[PDB]
Design a protein around this nucleic acid. Structure first.
Ligand SMILES: [Mg+2]
Ligand SMILES: [Mg+2]
Ligand SMILES: [Mg+2]
Ligand SMILES: [Mg+2]
Ligand SMILES: [Mg+2]
Ligand SMILES: [Mg+2]
Ligand SMILES: [Mg+2]
Ligand SMILES: [Mg+2]
Ligand SMILES: [Mg+2]
Ligand SMILES: [Mg+2]
Ligand SMILES: [Mg+2]
Ligand SMILES: [Mg+2]
Ligand SMILES: [Mg+2]
Ligand SMILES: [Mg+2]
Ligand SMILES: [Zn+2]
Lengths: 79, 205, 71, 50, 158, 120, 161, 45
RNA sequence: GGGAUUGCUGACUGAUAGUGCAAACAGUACUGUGAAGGAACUAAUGAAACUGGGCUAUAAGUGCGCAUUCCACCAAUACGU
RNA sequence: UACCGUACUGCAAACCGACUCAGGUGGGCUAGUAUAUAUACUCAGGCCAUAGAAUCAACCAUGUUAAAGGAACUCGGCAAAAU
């Protein structure tokens, strides 16, 4: 009867009929061109005077290893 | 046969096949009974198992080169007989015979001749069902050998709480402060460290 | 303004006499290319005839003329 | 006056009337959603998407 | 298996404005996917030697950022990225008519297309590699040119 | 360096670079965090190469996209393309590396695991 | 007489159906002696529209049947020409029948599978715009004598001095 | 800097599915678009 | 009372029947603003209406797959293979 | 200095009316004779695809002209004409 319980049952019902977006989901997929849906991005800042300011600690940093060249493990193991 | 397929109760509850592939068999029924052949492949379906033999149940196959009309080529091909329609030929009298699953010594199960003395010289040998070995054709680039892949590199002896393993490098100490051997110089080049440096140099000059 | 009963196959056939076409009693046939048309119509290559070999016209010599081409 | 064109489309009004949150805002809307679930409808509300 | 949840337009309207995180960690084990599209064969020969192009277009997932694509290319592939331009695309609709005629309709997963403009690596800048004619003569020639024909119809023979 | 995703560069020539298999979880449990980090980066770059290479050809992946493209199951000579088989092995390797890392994160005792679940 | 058989059941069903109608065509209406025939299936015309042209070529010899088809502007006459040309090709090259003695002794129009549509009448009432189809069966017999051509062949406008 | 048969409408262009550009997209729908060229300060039509 | 496994259970039904659905995706397509309503479609065989033409004018065998009971190994208490 | 929109259509064959439906659908910009965004012709621009082909039916719809009269028509100068 609670609000969260109804939403959880809706999501469990939507767990079935999932995968590559068949049926009604083909039309419902076009809601992203109709109501400005925000995608799964991480926000890097905030507007103060309408000019966006990217906070430098929220800029993306990738900890790549020192050398991936002549490293002795490949993505494939011999049979 | 019956055209439903799913109404059939699934047979072969214990998976044991008296006929194997590559063996001489006798066709018991159909358009060509009394003939013999060698089994090319057995389709092990629990509901409708078939056996394809060497050049016996020959029917013309209309191979359809993709087209709307009558453009196709025709090739004779061995149609699949039912598994029950065939029986193994014994090598002595040329007549069909029943194969039994006799147990010999060492706990192994073999295929005997259905005799009251089932022993050596009555065993029908069964060939192996697999030969796809990629072990030949290995050692290509982008591959690693099994002995290299099984190194015990991981140890829990290290990795203990080390908040001060920084070594003080601009952001190569940030990762081992958040818990790391060497960051690439290109990765630190991506987060530019020269926007303030140019303003500092211009102010100095 | 509405049929009161269903028309029978015999009555329908009798009513449909106006819809039929009359057969034509003459045809102009080209001996070469086997083309078929009316005797008052050109049916050679200038009109629609992809089978025309030009043998339908058996003589056409006209070399001499003189004029001012306007350019 | 010709009839038949009562449906004047608007995304704001469609989501604000028959969307998930107005259905969840009231108890009887929540039993409407619950019997939509018990029937087995693939689309629970007019604004559901993924 | 856990997968993509349904989202609701009223729910994103009500619980709106995602906030920036308080801390950003350097990304060990990143989950980010890029692929090129088709190149012209002369561009493919341009990549085969010296490994560079001025403009390369990529398919990504729509949960990425221009900063993330620029940082990933600079960090991993050693490139110099000047600017990124991102386009959000819908999936293609697919039709796969069934044993009884149903018109089974699918939709591919939504993707983001990035246009990445590159920069010459170090000292190699010569490979930008490009008489006159008056623009008055260009416009006067393009005004006396014959018009484009109207588009034929799919049943129309020309 | 755009040659890395630009092409296999061994496929235009008629030779196969990878003739092997993908990593398994029991072998991956024996590798250290640094070795898993380097293998993860190499495997993601291989994933970008394979996705680009099967995007230049018009061949599906995942065996669920094949139903969408109306391509028959198994008997199509498309599941037998080398790039698709390598792509499935690379996805298995990345999934198994993720599974090993959460197993090691769940195998800890103090607040170090709250930091171990922040880099995975 | 086909001691062999097809591999798939669909091809075997089709081949047996074909032999059953080749039995029914022989020793039935006509049959007997050697006959060139054709069956043009799924003509995109109504049965009445085809029957308008088929009543002209019924019983005529082959050349004046081609003449009667070639002298009208109807769309159905081109399909009737296609059927007559297919029957002539079968009779002359598949069989060994003599030309210039072929008579169109059997031609008729049968129903085809229709495509149902919809038409929008006023006040909300539905209608139809069904697309009709038909089949053509042409049988060309060979006469014992070359027959009267029924339409006098005259010289064209091109044949002029 | 411009392909004027395309501008006047008598030739096909790069990205031919646009057929009516806004203020931006003039630069990239031009058939003579050079990626190596620098990008102007205002990006006009 | 209710929710899932099993039925050597059925003088229950057998594709206009039986659940609304035996099916690649049925509470689907589709209808409606919405709550809500809500189909058709198995595999062969191919009846009639209908429309053209013609005419008339030996209750058996043989193979496979299991189930029952014998046997010999059994957890040794229901059979475990 | 990120994220979302950017194709195409938008008095309409792409929206709302079961339809390629003579219906309904908001705001803005504009040249000359000329003078008002009215009216006639025209600029920039667009259009002459969604049944075609001839011909003297009757009749129907919509109009032009009509001798001498003139509401005598008709329930009622309704409708046309007229200013
Ligand atoms: Mg009004
Ligand atoms: Mg309505
Ligand atoms: Mg943008
Ligand atoms: Mg039923
Ligand atoms: Mg039925
Ligand atoms: Mg019922
Ligand atoms: Mg049936
Ligand atoms: Mg009948
Ligand atoms: Mg209007
Ligand atoms: Mg209406
Ligand atoms: Mg309209
Ligand atoms: Mg005008
Ligand atoms: Mg017209
Ligand atoms: Mg007067
Ligand atoms: Zn001729």
């Amino acid at each position: 009867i609670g609000r969260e319980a109804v939403v959880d049952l809706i999501q469990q019902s939507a767990a079935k009929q999932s995968g590559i977006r068949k049926g009604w989901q083909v039309k419902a997929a076009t809601w992203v061109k109709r109501v400005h849906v925000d995608r799964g991005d991480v926000k890097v800042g905030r507007l103060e005077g309408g000019e966006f300011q990217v906070l430098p600690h929220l800029r993306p940093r990738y900890f790549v290893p020192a050398d991936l060249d002549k490293f002795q493990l490949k993505p494939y193991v011999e049979v | 046969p019956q055209a439903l397929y799913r109404s059939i109760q699934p047979m072969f509850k214990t998976n044991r096949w008296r006929i194997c592939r590559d063996d001489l068999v006798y066709i018991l029924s159909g358009p060509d009974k009394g003939k013999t052949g060698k089994v090319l492949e057995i389709i092990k379906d629990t509901r409708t198992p078939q056996v394809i033999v060497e050049g016996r149940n020959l029917r013309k196959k209309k191979v359809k080169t993709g087209t709307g009309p009558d453009d196709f080529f025709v090739v004779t091909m061995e149609a699949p007989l039912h598994y029950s329609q065939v029986q193994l030929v014994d090598p002595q009298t040329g007549k069909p015979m029943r194969v039994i699953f006799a147990y010999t010594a060492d706990g192994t199960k073999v295929r005997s001749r259905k005799v009251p003395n089932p022993s050596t010289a009555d065993i029908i040998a069964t060939p192996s069902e697999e030969d796809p070995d990629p072990r030949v054709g290995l050692t290509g680039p982008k591959d690693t050998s099994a002995s290299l892949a099984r190194q015990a590199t991981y140890t829990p002896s290290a990795g203990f709480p080390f908040r001060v393993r920084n070594l003080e490098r601009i952001w190569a100490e940030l990762q081992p402060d958040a818990d790391x051997x060497x960051x690439x110089x290109x990765x630190x080049x991506x987060x530019x460290x020269x926007x303030x440096x140019x303003x500092x140099x211009x102010x100095x000059x | 303004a509405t049929p009161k009963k269903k028309l029978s196959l015999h009555r329908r056939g009798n009513r449909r006499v106006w819809y039929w076409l009359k057969r034509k009693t003459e045809v102009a046939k080209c001996s070469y290319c086997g083309a078929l048309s009316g005797r008052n119509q050109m049916f050679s290559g200038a009109a629609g005839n992809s089978a025309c070999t030009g043998q339908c016209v058996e003589q056409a010599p006209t070399p001499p003329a003189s004029s001012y081409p306007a350019e | 006056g010709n009839r038949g064109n009562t449906y004047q489309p608007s995304r704001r009004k469609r989501v604000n009337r028959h969307g998930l949150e107005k259905r969840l805002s009231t108890p009887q809307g929540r039993e409407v959603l619950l019997r939509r679930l018990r029937k087995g409808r693939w689309r629970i509300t007019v604004d559901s998407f993924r | 298996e856990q997968e993509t949840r349904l989202r609701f337009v009223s729910s994103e309207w009500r619980s709106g404005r995602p906030q920036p995180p308080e801390r950003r960690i350097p990304i060990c084990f990143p989950n980010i996917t890029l692929q090129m599209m088709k190149l012209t064969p002369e561009q493919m020969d341009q990549v085969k030697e010296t490994g560079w192009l001025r403009e390369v277009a990529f398919k990504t997932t729509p949960d990425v950022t221009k900063l993330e694509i620029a940082a990933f290319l600079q960090s991993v592939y050693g490139m110099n990225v000047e600017r990124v331009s991102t386009i959000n695309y819908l999936g293609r609709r697919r039709l796969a008519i069934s044993r009884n005629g149903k018109r089974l309709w699918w939709r591919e997963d939504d993707w983001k297309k990035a246009y990445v403009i590159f920069r010459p690596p170090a000292g190699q800048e010569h490979l930008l590699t490009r008489q006159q004619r008056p623009v008055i003569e260009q416009i006067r020639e393009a005004a006396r040119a014959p018009r484009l024909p109207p588009r034929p119809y799919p049943w129309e023979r020309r | 360096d755009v040659e890395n995703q630009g092409g296999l560069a061994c496929v235009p020539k008629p030779c196969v670079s990878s003739t092997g298999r993908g990593w398994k979880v029991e072998e991956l449990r024996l590798k250290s965090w640094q070795d898993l980090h380097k293998l993860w980066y190499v495997s993601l770059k291989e994933r970008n190469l394979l996705l680009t290479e099967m995007g230049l050809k018009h061949i599906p992946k995942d065996a669920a996209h094949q139903v969408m493209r109306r391509i028959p199951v198994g008997a199509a000579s498309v599941e037998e393309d080398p790039h698709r088989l390598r792509y499935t092995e690379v996805q298995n390797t990345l999934r198994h590396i993720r599974q090993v890392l959460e197993e090691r994160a769940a195998a800890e005792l103090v607040p170090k695991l709250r930091r171990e679940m922040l880099e995975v | 007489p086909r001691n062999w058989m097809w591999y798939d059941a669909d091809d075997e069903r089709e081949e047996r159906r074909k032999e059953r109608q080749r039995l029914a065509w022989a020793m039935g209406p006509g049959g007997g002696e050697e006959v060139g025939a054709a069956h043009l299936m799924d003509v995109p015309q109504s049965m009445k529209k085809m029957q308008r042209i088929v009543k002209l070529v019924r019983g005529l010899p082959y050349p004046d049947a081609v003449a009667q088809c070639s002298l009208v502007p109807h769309k159905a006459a081109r399909y009737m020409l296609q059927a007559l040309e297919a029957a002539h090709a079968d009779a002359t090259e598949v069989k060994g029948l003599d030309a210039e003695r072929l008579v169109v002794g059997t031609v008729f129009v049968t129903r085809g599978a229709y495509e149902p549509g919809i038409s929008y009448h006023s006040k909300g009432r539905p209608g139809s715009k069904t697309f009709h189809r038909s089949h053509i069966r042409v049988v060309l017999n060979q006469a014992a004598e070359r027959p009267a051509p029924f339409a006098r062949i005259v010289a064209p406008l091109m044949s002029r001095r | 800097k411009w392909d004027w048969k395309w501008v006047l409408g008598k030739a096909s262009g790069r990205k031919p599915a646009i057929t009516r550009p806004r203020r931006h997209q003039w630069h990239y729908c031009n058939p003579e678009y050079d990626p190596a060229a620098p990008l102007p300060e205002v990006l006009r039509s």
